[model samples]
Target: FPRVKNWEVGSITYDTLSAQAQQDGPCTPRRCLGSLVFPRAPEQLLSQARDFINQYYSSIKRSGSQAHEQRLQEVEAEVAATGTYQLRESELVFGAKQAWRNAPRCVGRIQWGKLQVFDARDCRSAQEMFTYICNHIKYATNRGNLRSAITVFPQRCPGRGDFRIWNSQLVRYAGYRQQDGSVRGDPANVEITELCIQHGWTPGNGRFDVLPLLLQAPDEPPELFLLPPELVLEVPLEHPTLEWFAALGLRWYALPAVSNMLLEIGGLEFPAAPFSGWYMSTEIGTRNLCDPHRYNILEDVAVCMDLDTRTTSSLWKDKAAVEINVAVLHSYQLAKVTIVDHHAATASFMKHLENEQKARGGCPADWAWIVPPISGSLTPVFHQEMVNYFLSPAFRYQPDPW
Candidate 1:
């Protein structure tokens, strides 16, 4: 009986598509990679997720002692059914390194690889596969002082192997550095083409090879083709104007007293998450891909011979642009590599890629929503401003808006 279909979502505006999945049988788009805003780009989505993880490690290093363990279980079910649990391309590769120091310019840094899915059998919607890992990678970077822009991994492709240095920073400011230091600022409008369909120049830059490798475009800004797509995509709802939702509710009432002063100080703990920590512990990463007592979600990220016995170490700037002896965090953890399944067959190929993107979003159109941060209780950090001491927030009272 679970076969009832009808879907159609896409949108130029109204009548674009909407039966709203027969009222709700497939309505969940609030969180699986949360209605994907500007997903492509990050070095062309980590070079097509490292060319399907080196075509499933060269099909188990070129098969057969006996059908090479059944062709490594049929190419690890085609690289776990090539959907890689969306999060806007692994949140532009693990969003500002797991909430940069802890949500500073509001937590960023999360670079590609780690939605580690598996709940397959053509999954229709666990919550849009958890909103495709909660809008799987959109907060590109630079809302300002992003703790001084510190993202430097595999600068120009280090032959792909273990990739994980994740985040780095040290700009300081002076009109944004130069003369020979290098900061040069500019790209920080917090994009997504003002919420889809505006289309222009939104690949301004903060590393990660500027999306789908050198701007696959989409999420607006390319000056939005000189304006007017409904004034760049519709948002004027000032409803019941309660003083305009009280000045748009001042950045969510200053984020739960700065998320309870970054959990008291900030080493950030979870023991099952919910107290609202880690940007409201969104289930998009399905508790690290269907929890099996999680161990780096399936380990094997090697390739570090002291970054292959390196030497080039330059950070000069001026006439050098951005030279290096070899320390983009030792070439982003020596070009990372590994994507295990261990049965349930990468969760039946991420439930047939969440039932083929809920049979291609068969209804409801203009989708996109995230609203995450709202953690409290147990604060921790203090060790010299770990990104604003883990994004200061510890609530003694007022708590509600997540």
Candidate 2:
């Protein structure tokens, strides 16, 4: 068992649940890969199938009952004959929630039990995939009051390539490379933006052009579909006090939907499951706006605020960053969009950890990620030590669908 501690609160916890991790992570006696984002599977499927079935039964308090035994036997028989099996609708729902619950890097696990799982496994074509995705966006966006949701596409099977969403996220701004080697939009999306153009998308010249979806069914070439702009809720950023901040012309999409990660449940993999959750303010304010590789706007914003950026001791960057985060929260609230600030989000996560500790003996977390991008020390989670472990029914990153 791994013992965790909160340095500021003088509290400790033992993670007995870590022993149940189904796979070995990148860590060895030689080094640890906890902080690496890419730190980075399939069974011999029957074993995985059996274990997930067992977990499902235990969750419903029907472990070892006749229905549980029958379901286990049914899975073995299905796999023995067909090499794969389909999950019951209820089972899929449970597995989806558990996968969210088991995701170690997500700070929004406090909302794990409330996810709206859309089972799109019946989807047969890229066109159908487009319809499903659009419907998901509409339901999730909810006219700016975002709801946590996921749409699970068809699973991978023998002799077939995986269904894939080429975009890293369902909703992302375009990035156009300028002649001067500067990026006009989000630099993080330059590759996808270029790919969209190669596939016949009319490129837009703007700092915030929403990209189209490149949806692909098994073994087929990806298809491009323009997301209905009206369905995408965007919040125009403006500081509550700094009137000039609105002139920055900054805005962000309401829903944060990750489209490229693989959702693995039992022994199955849904390669095109896109999940959306509301954002935490700093994810936009500090990371997306301030990361040098992305927008790199801190210096620009500081200049507008008339702060002296010549010296680190002046604390201009710190002051400007906090104001930007405040603007993010204010703007989202102004737009009637759902967003959580770091203080409230981390506090909720602490309560979630306590709930998990009592219910499951431990909760897996990555401290590097759980801490906010700025003012981490001010958050309760920053003082807490966490144990990271790989759990089943998880969202795993897949290779790019190029």
Candidate 3:
């Protein structure tokens, strides 16, 4: 708790606190978790103390400054236990420790003589050698270590090995100016999770990359994975390469449709489930095979919608699936097409997409469902080309980062 004189406490008000934040940009750029601003003038430490408390109340956290308050107290108490100076007497609380743990991690440097006012004892002899104050802390990705103006508050039960679990709230007294002299104002109700999601940064994969291995199709190649299991559908030159698969696995419909031929394998049957198993690809020629309403199939689950059409599309997983799709030419407006095999009957994963081929020179124009004239419809087609051109090569070999 910051201390103040008896006479000056009454002047603190909500409006003054709000005005401070409005001018500071809510700890701009670093993405404050949502904090309030405090007004402080030179030679007015009492007013500063009161304004700090008032702004603390304005934090977006439902429980007030519960998280920061707790961490600050812990640091403050640890300094008290050091016996160099009591919490009330020290010029800076937890200043030395804050610098030791925070510097090089976040919060860069300090201005001289800026922290001498907090009862010099609390300011000069406390944590971080009292260096935590008067510093233009370097920007750090994690806010917990910041000392100059912001605080990275820990959430309850933050998960291990997950950086998203922690968020931050920036708080600085008003009149703090950046090098450009632009004013950063109050930005409340900021959510770290929401920011990351909107900006497309979850973790590890960098921006715009989705979580691991999601949005893959059934018969696509092992491009998404290294040396993918032969269990899924695959297409090779001849006999649907069942060598890598189990003996009793079922075959996929893709192999036969593409080759325009069907083989009578020993034990394969239609899927027992009332719904038809699907083979979808982004290849514009493949996806337009049918409408979602007719087959209860969905394409938008994988491909995010285009900015123009607000339409979504599907994604596939492997090379074999792509081969099958190209062979099947799933779109048939006036033609009679027979899809003989799916993954239902066979126990062998490799058995699923064996013995299939197709033959088609002129496809129906209505079959253009895969690659409609609309630019938005190119979503699936673009995806297909991306895999065939870019991702497939990456999967063929292993590279050493070192």
Candidate 4:
């Protein structure tokens, strides 16, 4: 079942819920790492705990009643004696809203049924996971009206070791690797800003410093925390006609959250689930300011729009990447904040892929992370055509304890 044709609205699908995806076509016909970055598990943890308790009673329609066969015989009698089993705060809020509706490189999943989750599974340490990440960044940075949370915390167990966060993005910035070596703030965070200055932190030469939270609790040893600069909001940038683009000091941050993924769920995992969603202005206007590796700033905004940078058909890097994506949607709408444009996040992910192809009959696209890194053939999900598998209360991508 793999028809999938959209070449821009010709429409025709088949995915058939990707035939219960477990593993299939990825790369073998020559090679196709699908744009590398992922790069999964849980044996028959009581058969993935009965398919996530049969998809949590088929999303509350009560699939086969008797409270879904006594909640599937209470997780087969607690995984038949503690191999692992336990989850019900409304089934961990429907498994963190199906791990943000099975995030396949999210383009703001049409607010995936509005998440919020938060549990903090009775934490344990790392300063109580830094007050549950400062109460989940003050309720998803509601100051700029952003909201779409997830907290989760304690889960991975067997003996001990696994409750980490080590910043993959709980608002990262600090890069600092300069001494005439050419690196200042965010060269994809120079080794997490030198592991927060070798753990004792205290390093902020500012160009957008904001970085500290180390947080690792299990066999202990990772704690850093520092993130309460007025609960972080930041907006800045300016160019409603280029008034020296806010004196080119620029700024960003308004909750993109991420915090080192790995939620899983059903075969239980959680590994410090941080999540958050709200921001799709070409991921901060054209891959975080003209990605040459974050903050490249396209020849300093094409020499401040004087253009004619030598010459490449005089497109000057596509007119300085659409005026730095219209100065990040006119500086996040003049600081009222909460952004979205890439033409309304790909027409809201093409109407969330037709409501997930009739509610999950098909829809797990990657198409290189759902297009939109600056008008690839002008949005509309770039002449659509997608199909990437893996589903089961996801969130994934992990590996970093140091």
Candidate 5:
């Protein structure tokens, strides 16, 4: 077997390797097997607590004040008593923002402080989880006026299975693996669609089928809930000037609510937390619609655009990709949906970098993710050298449930 490790996606780093050079590790990123381990080492906890405390105070301009000292002491005492400390409401709010700010993979960190955090630690059942998630979707979608938000469930507890949301997003289309060995829609969701079927869901045949939610609590079987269509806002994609584009029948949801990621704050893990941001046009245009594994519509779009598809030199793919991206931005704007183009997004991230450097001495960023997929050289981030590192109060990838 061979592997290449020069590029990275999500948590996986890839490099070309001969069989003799191969080592023990995943060839690609694997999801977390169980609830991710929280920091328990005394030194790590102390350091994380200090960083969080300082960040919290600095954010509010209360560093060295009495309230800051009191909160620091509280953290030290709590960590000493239980080997881990819990975040208060203010701390939780601060932590969530810091998590986004520290998120190496997100290009939208400039809006990190604006996230609406929902504390649902008191939720006792899958039904309650569903309710909170529905409310989150409704609030974040905001009828196509998307707002960034995150709903935090209880932290992972010892000796109990953690609460989990099975969907990758609060909203996604179903993928049907047809008899001809081809997927009918949203290939990225095929596995989840099959899980839905196994769980007694009657799958739909449409391209934009909204999948149901699978909510799981400790020691309980996962419960399925159908999301209200009204809450999951979608925009029918069409070009501003191209009538043929409307016939493509493309559309996308207003919010990108990632569900299956862990929110690590100070040493606690919230396995069920789901967060949302308004989409970057490329996420829908480049990756979702153009990725070979998803809609894979570059050729179709190219043909529609009347670009020569005979050779790569024709730059037909490139030309079509731009139009597709343009259509995405134009459609979302026409529908009054919140979406950012790569130029504006990367520029905002550059500002975020400068602001964070002034505040924290440096910003952690994954260069591969921060750089836009299309027109990498044109973005300001492409030439900038970024230092990436692990920071507490982070969002992390987790293994899918069995």
Candidate 6:
């Protein structure tokens, strides 16, 4: 059993802790160079370019050659002429992969090298941003076989506000405040859902209502676009043995496309990049559906499981929670969707740690997140020690759109 100490503090909200972990995770540059700063901003850009070039050349197995040196000079010359430099298509692709690898909260970093990067930095309007997001959902969902993907829109430029996607994900349930001050659906999404309602959009009362995308380009007011039902993929929840589970009418989207994270590559910030990986069973099973502030379904699930609800020693909540998670995994598997069980996911993450240590010298990870909520002591990651720090080419949470 894990012992509690005087210094053993933990956060109540998972989102806050996740954001903190990403902000603190160690990056390749910092691990290799020993610090995250330079004498000046231009020096920072040059340093990142040199590091990117070195990594790129090594990946292709061509190093210390005239071509590598020439590319470095070209990067410097571009920065000297213009205040900023641009990443080559190859560099952008590589940086996106690195960003995913550096995500401390994610247990799916083993698939970092397999992500599909969509460069939509040329988007000039909110409508174009919506179209790009829709295309990302269509391709990533892949009719149940989910793929890891990221669609990057315009980067933040000086003297102008950045392009931004306001929703947390491409698909989410709308939370409506009832007259009695209770929320109807996902309480976590109450603010964004209310913003949509204020923007002249109608919301559904069901638990699985897909919220519209709120898009803003630079200085313009945000625009709302409804996602097509066909583009959105959801699996109806049902347990393999529990006959009454289907009557609960629960479901979740196949892809977890995060929309409000800033994608920083080298020294540039792309404020409208939405990226995703296929779901991990615990994400849907434990946190999103079972957290007391969110869906709050533990008691209901316990009653359905016919456990002794009268006593804590009965462990009814724990039993029902495990069944809920098992049902999520079963439903996704039956639907042919990509989802990882916590056991497999943590084992894979441990593998990722060993690989990163050999490849990049260190891997940043948040112990709280890397360990699954249910059965923490059983997973190997629960016993592993991890260090977290800031690194460039990271995905960071942005402020909510009013």
Q: Quick one: best lDDT, which candidate?
A: 2
Model 2 agreement with the true structure over 249-294: per-residue lDDT tens digits: 9999899999999999988989889999999999999999999999
**How do these models rank on TM-score, best leading?**
2, 6, 5, 4, 1, 3
Candidate 4 lDDT by residue in tens digits, 1-402: 989888866988888987897635456669877787755333477777788888989888889888888877878787677778789898898888887787777867878889888888889898988998898888888888888888888898789888888889888889898889788877988898898889899997877889888888889888788887898899988878878878979799888988887888877888788888788777787888889888889988898889888878888987888888888888888888788887877888888988999998788878777887666768888788888877877877777876
Query: How do the residues 161-235 of candidate 6 rate in per-residue lDDT, one tens digit apiece?
Result: 888888988898999887798888899999999999998888888766888888888898888899888888999
The top-ranked prediction according to TM-score is 2
Predicted structure 5, TM vs. truth: 0.86
> Each candidate: what lDDT?
0.22, 0.92, 0.21, 0.83, 0.83, 0.81
Residue-level lDDT tens digits of model 3 in 301-388: 1222222223323233223334334333332111222222221111121111111101111111111222222233223221221100
TM-score of each: 0.17, 0.98, 0.14, 0.39, 0.86, 0.87
- Cα TM-score of candidate 1: 0.17
Q: How does candidate 6 fare on TM-score? A: 0.87
Q: Over the stretch 153-246, how does candidate 1's per-residue lDDT look in tens digits?
A: 2111223222111111111001122347443321221122222223433433232111111111122112111221121111111212122222
lDDT of 1: 0.22
Worst 10 residues of 5 by lDDT: 14-23
> Of the pair 1 and 2, which is ahead by TM-score?
2
Q: What lDDT is obtained when candidate 5 is compared to the true structure?
A: 0.83
Estimate the overall C-alpha local distance difference test score of candidate 3: 0.21
The 10 consecutive residues of candidate 6 with the worst lDDT sum are 11-20
